[PDB]
């Protein structure tokens, strides 16, 4: 059996996570099991780097007025 964290999101973010897995942008293949087109299963020891990558992707194409 597999123990970790279930992540639910839109298919675009799921595919972004898949690309991160295949490109080894986090340094390893920790994105192990894919269950649904909109749900994935990720080991919980590196949820922080995934959050940082998601935030960087989100605010990259944002053009903050600050």
């Amino acid at each position: 059996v597999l123990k970790g964290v279930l992540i639910e999101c839109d298919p675009a973010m799921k595919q972004f996570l898949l690309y991160l897995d295949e490109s080894n942008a986090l340094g390893k293949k920790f994105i192990i099991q894919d269950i649904d087109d909109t749900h994935v299963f990720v080991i919980a020891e590196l949820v922080n780097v995934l959050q940082e990558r998601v935030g960087e992707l989100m605010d990259q194409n944002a053009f903050s007025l600050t």
């Binding site: 595919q15 972004f16 944002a62 053009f63 007025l65």
Partner: protein
């Protein structure tokens, strides 16, 4: 000066809040003006601020203006004096003018009329009332090259001397750095040397009050000064130029951007100036209607600044044209004046007054500052919100509706980064479905539709899929003209596609719906021009972007000019009745088939 919350606070600087709030204005120490629109004195305060400063944003409640040296030069150019402007600013301050503006205003306004530039007998001279300033600038190395041969003293009468004609731009750039800005005043009332023409506009072309204000500010004390007037394309822009040309009553030269804008200006002159066709000439190497010996000449850029070999007839026409003075040289689409070859155009012809007209003064590369000395100060800036409130400008309901990225496309979008992702978010199936739904809806409600789409490679399959007319751009001259001519007066066809061709001042007919897809990156000028093609909720225009892509950032950063103008972009996330009818790319098979044909570019 203090940064307790990261905000520049000036509470201690301006405490003069005597009694008590009746003045709807706030001043800033460095420089800024905040105006309250919901005031009984709103019109008078607006008129006062327009004549002295240029706006930086005009929302519905609190306008914000900026104080600049060129704005003060324009203010002092009009009959307004230093004492009057200072006392009226102090009159409506509600907080007290900080002691950093009065000194700044005084310094800007002191050196206005000290140095003047004049044109006489095809010769450029610089005249100064005070002889000392000439010796002040004599030691400047850049100026000394203008005189030839050294212009020992040029004893006249008031001290003046000749300058090199082709180096006028350099001295214009230097003078402002020397705190001695030049002024371009043409006293056309009494010349007796220039052959004035018998142009006279018909007394049937009435003009709106804002055009009256712009013209009145152009001619403040019986003389015409070079300036820039910014008016929307739908509003009356050519009429202002025609009226200015008639008032100047001199030989007029009009410069357009495209080879079709010259015909537009000729039509405007024939409509509102009552000028015989013999005097009107167009010099664009198409008919050559004897431009030699003409009163009004109309031509375009990229023809007066050729660095290559020129046609034999064109060479003689240019030689004749460069041998006489010009009255009120009119430039169209002045925003694209600061170019590598367009700047020298003003140096290749000699004219007294240079009047520039445009609708979108915003431009990248921060070269608009150069336009302050290339032509003159920003004279008039029309308020678009109050313009559309009077009903003479269509109130366009702006919309920014985005579509999610399809799963078959987002993987490729995140996979590639070397400039190959443009087609991926340009040809988003969801955006295609949204565009098709909008087209069908506005055809069912019978609205004229213009669909702007750059990246014509995508526009090909975007337009042939719906089997609708489109303008590739490198097609021909007749086909585009006939398509645009039959677009308006034909009930069967009411939707057209334009690929970066309509990004200028053309003769496109009235339309109510504009849909832009995959435009340039941050071209605020392009989006403002596209919006200008609609106004003339009577109308409304949509912008389609793809989520989680660079197009979102581009749309966010390109709409700031319009929100400064006062428009608001409502976000639409769901389209009502999207699944009510059948649209293209309904199933995943054709969506995944699209990947092969969109990656089939392989431009390597």
């Amino acid at each position: 000066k203090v940064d307790e919350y990261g905000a520049k606070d000036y509470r201690l600087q301006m405490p003069l809040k005597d009694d008590h709030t009746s003045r709807p204005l706030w001043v800033a120490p460095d420089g800024h003006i905040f105006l309250e629109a919901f005031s009984p004195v709103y019109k008078y305060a607006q008129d006062f601020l327009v004549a002295i400063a240029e706006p930086v944003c005009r929302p519905t409640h609190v306008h914000e203006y900026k104080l600049t040296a060129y704005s003060l030069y324009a203010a002092v150019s009009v009959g307004l004096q230093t004492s009057d402007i200072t006392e009226y600013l102090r009159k409506l301050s509600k907080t007290g003018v900080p002691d950093g503006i009065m000194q700044f205003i005084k310094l800007c306004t002191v050196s206005y009329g000290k140095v003047k530039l004049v044109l006489k007998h095809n010769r450029y001279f610089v005249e100064s009332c005070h002889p000392d300033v000439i010796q002040h600038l004599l030691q400047d190395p850049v100026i000394r090259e203008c005189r030839l041969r050294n212009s020992e003293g040029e004893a006249t009468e008031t001290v003046s001397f000749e300058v090199k004609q082709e180096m006028i731009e350099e001295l214009q750039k230097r003078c402002i750095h020397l705190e001695y800005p030049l002024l371009a005043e043409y006293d056309f009332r009494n010349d007796s040397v220039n052959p004035d023409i018998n142009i006279d506009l018909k007394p049937t072309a009435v003009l709106r009050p804002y055009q009256e204000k712009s013209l009145r500010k152009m001619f403040g004390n019986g003389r015409a000064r070079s300036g820039v007037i910014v008016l929307p394309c739908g509003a009356g822009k050519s009429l202002v130029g025609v009226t200015a040309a008639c008032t100047v009553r001199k030989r007029c030269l009009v410069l357009g951007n495209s080879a079709v804008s010259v015909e537009q200006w000729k039509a405007q002159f024939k409509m509102w100036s009552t000028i015989d066709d013999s005097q009107i000439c167009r010099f664009t190497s198409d008919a050559k209607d004897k431009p030699i010996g003409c009163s009004v000449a109309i031509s375009t850029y990229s023809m007066l600044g050729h660095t290559t070999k020129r046609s034999w007839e064109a060479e003689r026409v240019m030689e004749w044209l460069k041998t006489q003075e010009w009255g009120l040289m009119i430039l169209d689409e002045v925003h694209t004046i600061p170019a590598k070859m367009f700047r020298r155009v003003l140096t290749i012809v000699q004219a007294h007054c240079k009047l520039g007209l445009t609708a979108t003064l915003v431009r990248e590369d921060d070269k608009i500052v150069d336009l302050n000395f290339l032509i003159g100060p920003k004279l008039y800036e029309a308020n678009w919100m109050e313009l559309q409130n009077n009903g003479y400008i269509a109130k366009v309901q702006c919309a920014e509706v985005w579509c999610p990225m399809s799963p078959e496309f987002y993987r490729e979008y995140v996979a590639i980064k070397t400039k190959k992702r443009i087609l991926l978010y340009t040809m988003n199936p969801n955006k295609f479905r949204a565009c098709q739904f909008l087209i069908k809806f506005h055809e069912r409600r019978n609205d004229k539709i213009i669909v702007f789409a750059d990246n014509v490679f995508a526009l090909k399959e975007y337009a042939i899929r719906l089997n609708k007319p489109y303008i590739y751009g490198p097609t021909s001259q007749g086909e585009r003209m006939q398509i645009l001519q039959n677009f308006k007066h034909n009930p069967k066809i009411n939707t057209i596609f334009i690929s970066k061709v309509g990004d200028t001042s053309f003769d496109l007919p009235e339309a109510n719906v504009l849909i832009q897809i995959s435009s340039h990156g941050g071209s605020r000028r392009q989006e403002a021009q596209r919006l200008g093609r609609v106004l003339r909720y009577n109308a409304f225009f949509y912008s389609l972007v793809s989520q989680d892509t660079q197009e979102m950032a581009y749309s966010t950063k390109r709409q700031r000019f319009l929100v400064d103008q006062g428009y608001s972009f409502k976000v639409i996330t769901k389209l009502a009745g999207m699944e009510e009818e059948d649209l293209a790319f309904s199933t995943k098979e054709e969506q995944q088939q699209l990947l092969q044909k969109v990656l089939a570019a392989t431009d390597l």
